[PDB]
Amino acid sequence: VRNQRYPASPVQEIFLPEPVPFVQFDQTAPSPNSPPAPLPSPSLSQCEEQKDRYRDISSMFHRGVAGAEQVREAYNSMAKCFRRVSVAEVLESDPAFRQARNFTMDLKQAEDDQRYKQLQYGRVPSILTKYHL
Amino acid sequence: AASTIPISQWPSLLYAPPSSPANPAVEALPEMQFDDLHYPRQMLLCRGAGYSLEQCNRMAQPDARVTPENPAEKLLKEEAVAAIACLSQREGGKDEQCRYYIERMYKLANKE
Amino acid sequence: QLKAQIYGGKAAPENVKVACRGRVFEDADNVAMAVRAFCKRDPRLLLFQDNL
Amino acid sequence: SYLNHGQNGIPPSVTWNFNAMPYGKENPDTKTFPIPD
Amino acid sequence: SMDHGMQYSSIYWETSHRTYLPFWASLTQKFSWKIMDDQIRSFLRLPKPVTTEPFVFSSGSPYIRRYFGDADISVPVPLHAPAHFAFVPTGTVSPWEETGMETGPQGAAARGAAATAFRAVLESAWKCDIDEQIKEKLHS
Amino acid sequence: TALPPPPSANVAVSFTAAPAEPLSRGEVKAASLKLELQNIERELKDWWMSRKILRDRNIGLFNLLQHHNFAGLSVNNAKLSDSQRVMWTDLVQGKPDVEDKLSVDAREMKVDMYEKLFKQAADLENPCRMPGVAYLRCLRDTLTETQSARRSSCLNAFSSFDACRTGLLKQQSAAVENSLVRQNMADVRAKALFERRAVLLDLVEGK
Amino acid sequence: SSPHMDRLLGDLKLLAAYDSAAGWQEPKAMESAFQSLSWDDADVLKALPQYLNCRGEQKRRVDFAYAALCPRPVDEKDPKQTLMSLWMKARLFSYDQKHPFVLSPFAA
Amino acid sequence: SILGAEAFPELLSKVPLNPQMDEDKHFNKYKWGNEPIPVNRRTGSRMNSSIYDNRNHEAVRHPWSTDARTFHPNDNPEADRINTQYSNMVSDSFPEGGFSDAPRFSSNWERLLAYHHGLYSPEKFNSTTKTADEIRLAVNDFAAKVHADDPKNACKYLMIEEFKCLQSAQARIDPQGAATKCVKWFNEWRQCAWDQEKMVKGYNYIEDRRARKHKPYIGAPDLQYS
Amino acid sequence: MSVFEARSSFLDLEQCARAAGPQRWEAECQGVRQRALQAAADVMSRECGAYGDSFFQCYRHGFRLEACQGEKATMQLLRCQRMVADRLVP
Numbered sequence A: 001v002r003n004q005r006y007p008a009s010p011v012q013e014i015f016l017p018e019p020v021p022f023v024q025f026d027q028t029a030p031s032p033n034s035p036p037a038p039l040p041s042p043s044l045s046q047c048e049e050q051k052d053r054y055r056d057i058s059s060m061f062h063r064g065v066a067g068a069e070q071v072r073e074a075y076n077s078m079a080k081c082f083r084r085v086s087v088a089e090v091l092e093s094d095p096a097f098r099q100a101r102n103f104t105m106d107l108k109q110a111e112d113d114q115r116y117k118q119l120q121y122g123r124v125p126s127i128l129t130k131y132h133l
Numbered sequence B: 001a002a003s004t005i006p007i008s009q010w011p012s013l014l015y016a017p018p019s020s021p022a023n024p025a026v027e028a029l030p031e032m033q034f035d036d037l038h039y040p041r042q043m044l045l046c047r048g049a050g051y052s053l054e055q056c057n058r059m060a061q062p063d064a065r066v067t068p069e070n071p072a073e074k075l076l077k078e079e080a081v082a083a084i085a086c087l088s089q090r091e092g093g094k095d096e097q098c099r100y101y102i103e104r105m106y107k108l109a110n111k112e
Numbered sequence C: 001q002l003k004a005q006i007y008g009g010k011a012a013p014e015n016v017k018v019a020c021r022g023r024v025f026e027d028a029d030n031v032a033m034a035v036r037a038f039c040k041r042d043p044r045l046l047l048f049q050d051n052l
Numbered sequence D: 001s002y003l004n005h006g007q008n009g010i011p012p013s014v015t016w017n018f019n020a021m022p023y024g025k026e027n028p029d030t031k032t033f034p035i036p037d
Numbered sequence E: 001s002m003d004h005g006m007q008y009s010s011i012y013w014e015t016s017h018r019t020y021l022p023f024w025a026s027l028t029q030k031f032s033w034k035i036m037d038d039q040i041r042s043f044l045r046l047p048k049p050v051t052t053e054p055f056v057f058s059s060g061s062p063y064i065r066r067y068f069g070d071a072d073i074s075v076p077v078p079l080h081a082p083a084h085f086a087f088v089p090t091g092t093v094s095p096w097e098e099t100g101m102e103t104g105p106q107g108a109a110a111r112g113a114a115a116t117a118f119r120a121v122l123e124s125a126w127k128c129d130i131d132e133q134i135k136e137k138l139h140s
Numbered sequence F: 001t002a003l004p005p006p007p008s009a010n011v012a013v014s015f016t017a018a019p020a021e022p023l024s025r026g027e028v029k030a031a032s033l034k035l036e037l038q039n040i041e042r043e044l045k046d047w048w049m050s051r052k053i054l055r056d057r058n059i060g061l062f063n064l065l066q067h068h069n070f071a072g073l074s075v076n077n078a079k080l081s082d083s084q085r086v087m088w089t090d091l092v093q094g095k096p097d098v099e100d101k102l103s104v105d106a107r108e109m110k111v112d113m114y115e116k117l118f119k120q121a122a123d124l125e126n127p128c129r130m131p132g133v134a135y136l137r138c139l140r141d142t143l144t145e146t147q148s149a150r151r152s153s154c155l156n157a158f159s160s161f162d163a164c165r166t167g168l169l170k171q172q173s174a175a176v177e178n179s180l181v182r183q184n185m186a187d188v189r190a191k192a193l194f195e196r197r198a199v200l201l202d203l204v205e206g207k
Numbered sequence G: 001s002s003p004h005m006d007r008l009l010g011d012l013k014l015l016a017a018y019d020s021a022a023g024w025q026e027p028k029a030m031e032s033a034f035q036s037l038s039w040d041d042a043d044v045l046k047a048l049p050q051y052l053n054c055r056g057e058q059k060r061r062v063d064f065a066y067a068a069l070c071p072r073p074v075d076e077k078d079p080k081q082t083l084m085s086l087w088m089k090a091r092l093f094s095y096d097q098k099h100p101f102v103l104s105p106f107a108a
Numbered sequence H: 001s002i003l004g005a006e007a008f009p010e011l012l013s014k015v016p017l018n019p020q021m022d023e024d025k026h027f028n029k030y031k032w033g034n035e036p037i038p039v040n041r042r043t044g045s046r047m048n049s050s051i052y053d054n055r056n057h058e059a060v061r062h063p064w065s066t067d068a069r070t071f072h073p074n075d076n077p078e079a080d081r082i083n084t085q086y087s088n089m090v091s092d093s094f095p096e097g098g099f100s101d102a103p104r105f106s107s108n109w110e111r112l113l114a115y116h117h118g119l120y121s122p123e124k125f126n127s128t129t130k131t132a133d134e135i136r137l138a139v140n141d142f143a144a145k146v147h148a149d150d151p152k153n154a155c156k157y158l159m160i161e162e163f164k165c166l167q168s169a170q171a172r173i174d175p176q177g178a179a180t181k182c183v184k185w186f187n188e189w190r191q192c193a194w195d196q197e198k199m200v201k202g203y204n205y206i207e208d209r210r211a212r213k214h215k216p217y218i219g220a221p222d223l224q225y226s
Numbered sequence I: 001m002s003v004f005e006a007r008s009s010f011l012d013l014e015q016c017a018r019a020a021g022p023q024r025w026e027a028e029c030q031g032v033r034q035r036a037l038q039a040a041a042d043v044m045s046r047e048c049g050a051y052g053d054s055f056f057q058c059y060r061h062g063f064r065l066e067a068c069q070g071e072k073a074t075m076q077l078l079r080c081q082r083m084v085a086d087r088l089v090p
């Protein structure tokens, strides 16, 4: 059942092994130099099908011919539609996120910065501090 | 390529694990601690001093000798907040919608 | 003296120590006698950092 | 009274045997540090 | 059924393997200079080994040598009846009992601080949910 | 001692002895009483066997400790030397300290004796080991001093040591008390079960 | 009717899945997890900047709980791991500031 | 009112927690598929191991009734073992969920007697394997305690290493097998103890003169050793 | 800490709420609220700890064990909590 990484294992592994993948981003496409455009602020005017389908499927489940997976799916879609407006309200109201919204920076400054010198993990205190010695 | 690790090489496997897409801080693995004796020892010491159970429970505090905190949470604060906002707005960064912030953070942290 | 000779009389790292066959030496110890005691006829020394 | 009709010491908690000692030219259960040639 | 066993494997000599024994080997015999050396030492009053003295100075605790029919065959035996000490309280442990199943501090500590913390987190989340339910019920 | 196994029929009885008429009220009640009796006997057996096994094991442990000449927080050993007893009582109840009458070499020897004794007594899992070792290390550091000048420096560690010490003592006391209470409750329950079984045997019926 | 509990358990499952996919070399699965890691919770989003500035006993409680759940130190260079850690810590901070934690076995 | 709506994102978004779940629920997000862990490695009972034992490869006998189907270690593993983490390695020598030889005692005195005779310990019978994180936490706590005990000790790291090897070999559930691995570090610690003692208390011996044939060949270098 | 105590605490809460009113309850009935929640929490912990510890073990082991297969590891805990709530608060 396993899909071998090296179908020609005795030969492929030697001169063309597989490297450790990189998951932060694709790394094969260009790097955007601009942030994403601010999506339109949402509202409850877009929960039509979500609400009505959730109602229908909940009724059909109370009957007993619907199931639970459909109920979960519909409820989660509707809840996402509501969380959209909740998060929009939070972002636009709370002040700590205004800087994050109007945050901008370039790869050149990223490479020129020098904060990477201080990314060293600390050291756990001594166990004698528990006894206060 | 990835060959079996016998049972005799497990102690070295624990503090020098193989490379993965999500690696831990190998230089900090010897610093990960979580004391199961914290509260028992605290209570024992206080009761030996002469306090009561209620006084001991009021004076008790959580352990500070735990795994250290990531310095990124203090150095890359603004970039992390911006990335989290992007994720909250763009459904977790599906189809590469927070690549901007993620790549800025990656560059800042790695420097080639 | 061995540590200074290794690091060229310059500032060495912190908590650096010497071991032979897994056995740590004191800094105020003669290398010859310490080897005679711990690693007899196996003088392979290792410099490591002792934070612990 | 029948509680004291039969206490020398106790049975051993653990035991060690000869077959538990490792042996082998290649067996890494005997290798700590390389022995010089 | 172990004594007086049969020959289980074959005995043989491979072709042209050497033997290293001459034809007078059976008349040859061994010899050690140790007996003569001991006689000579005793006669000339040469330095004796300390094994001739039963008391042992090679440690702090008292040891006495037990000899097996000769000064060359001895074993040191300790004289002290050593007193042992335990900085431990009695009746504070019942290992046969599984303690992770009983409710109490000893139970949580036979379990761990991680499980206790997880239980406390679940407790807090459940309290949040129940507080929401209480609000929506009493507001009616 | 045991009884011999009960006798068995020589000719095979398969079902010839089975009842040809349903039971009656009295027989049903007698069966219920028999079940109650067997449950009571099971409980009594559990109590008795647990008590017996624990008593035997603990007496064996005591004899083993007495045979190997052990001494604990409760100093109840008569084969101890007076010096060893003084040292152990200082580690358990008093304050370990070197006297000014001694020479520096003898002070070093005394501290080494304290350290050896305490390290053989307390293992790495023991809570008081670190405070004790810290206090003795402070003593080693402050050998070439007087007790008056050494107190100010070693008090901060002796406090923690004494705290752990008193904690262990309180643990031992509480363990004794709780074990006594639990034991007495169990024994009373067993006695009550025995009397209940007695009355049920006086009421039982059959032959 | 139990959103806090549900999302807590879900986030834990997703952390476990991310770790397993990393061990098995599965970028697709681990990115699926990261995307499904409940980033649209207004409460946690609002508590994030509060945790980033908290200090003292509350911070120590939250860090104790986070070490109980995820004691392994993440790589200081992996922003995805850093962000998931921050999100879990913010969730715990919200739960704590609503109803504080009681981490000691001794309590009454 | 449905139960657990927001609690199964793994199900809503087809996120598998492991290749087994992926293969089961047919999510197909693991590029390399799944090689199932067979049942003889998922569960089983403790077995005798030594060839110098007559009941080798046979289940261990206990006072209680036990399923005698044994856990089989992975003796012929595949060349590619993509996950070389402790999680996937431990399954080749122990079952993660523990062995299937745990008792359910009908009474308390049976438990007491088994323990008294050395045939039962809950630490050994009612337990799972230790995860790498737990092992590391225990090792680091022990190392801190040892360092606090004595920093200027030479056998410190040797003691730490025997502790580490016991924890890694799961001595809680396989004490004999783990001691078989850690007795070497114990022996090294013993040697280091003697060495430290002889360096502290000056203990030396009169060395004899150099032998006439110390060098096998005149042209050979006589490397000096302390 | 017991079911009886928790039920009595919730009755005290409800009667004090009826006394205060729908406008000042949240301000006048905080201590009783906290006591009731803590008692219900102790009950929930006592009656659902096994399932919580099982979920914790499954999470530690990445849901690789036998008992961690499927969704029972989570549904059991959620069902225990729902039962405790339905037994206490109404």
Ligand SMILES: CCCCCCCCCCCCCCCCCC(=O)OC[C@H](COP(=O)([O-])OCC(O)COP(=O)([O-])OC[C@@H](COC(=O)CCCCCCCCCCCCCCCCC)OC(=O)CCCCCCCCCCCCCCCCC)OC(=O)CCCCCCCCCCCCCCCCC
Pocket: E017, E018, E019, E020, E021, E022, E023
């Ligand atoms: C093609 C190549 C050409 C190029 C050459 C290249 C090579 C160049 C380099 C040289 C080679 C080096 C190679 C490396 C060698 C390492 C290996 C090795 O050597 O040992 C292996 C090999 C391994 O054996 P082993 O099992 O390991 O045991 C090792 C022991 O240490 C030893 O074992 P052992 O001690 O048991 O064996 C000794 C043996 C033999 O030892 C001896 O005998 C001592 C030697 C004495 C020789 C002189 C006496 C001759 C008498 C002749 C008279 C006969 C009557 C005349 C008849 C004439 C008509 C035919 O003893 C006996 O068997 C019993 C005899 C006991 C009596 C001896 C003393 C009395 C002597 C007088 C007789 C008196 C009889 C009275 C009876 C009683 C009456 C009352 O060693 C031997 O076999 C030793 C004996 C070898 C004999 C070989 C037989 C052939 C000899 C002829 C050689 C060629 C001759 C050439 C022409 C010259 C002659 C005309």
Ligand SMILES: CCCCCCCCCCCCO[C@@H]1O[C@H](CO)[C@@H](O[C@H]2O[C@H](CO)[C@@H](O)[C@H](O)[C@H]2O)[C@H](O)[C@H]1O
Pocket: H209, H210, H211, H212
């Ligand atoms: C002008 C100086 C004298 C010039 C002539 C030198 C001749 C020396 C070579 C003779 C052979 C020496 O071979 C070997 O070396 C030295 C002595 O030298 C001895 O070595 C031994 O005794 C000497 C005492 O002198 C010790 O210092 C040494 O630690 C010990 O190993 C050996 O017992 C001897 O077997």
Ligand SMILES: CCCCCCCCCCCCO[C@@H]1O[C@H](CO)[C@@H](O[C@H]2O[C@H](CO)[C@@H](O)[C@H](O)[C@H]2O)[C@H](O)[C@H]1O
Pocket: H209, H210, H211, H212
């Ligand atoms: C009936 C007539 C009897 C005649 C008796 C004649 C007695 C002659 C006795 C000479 C014995 C000499 O014995 C030999 O001498 C040399 C030096 O001299 C010693 O010394 C030699 O070996 C030792 C170490 O191996 C070192 O001292 C040194 O490396 C070397 O000089 C040997 O250790 C000793 O084995």
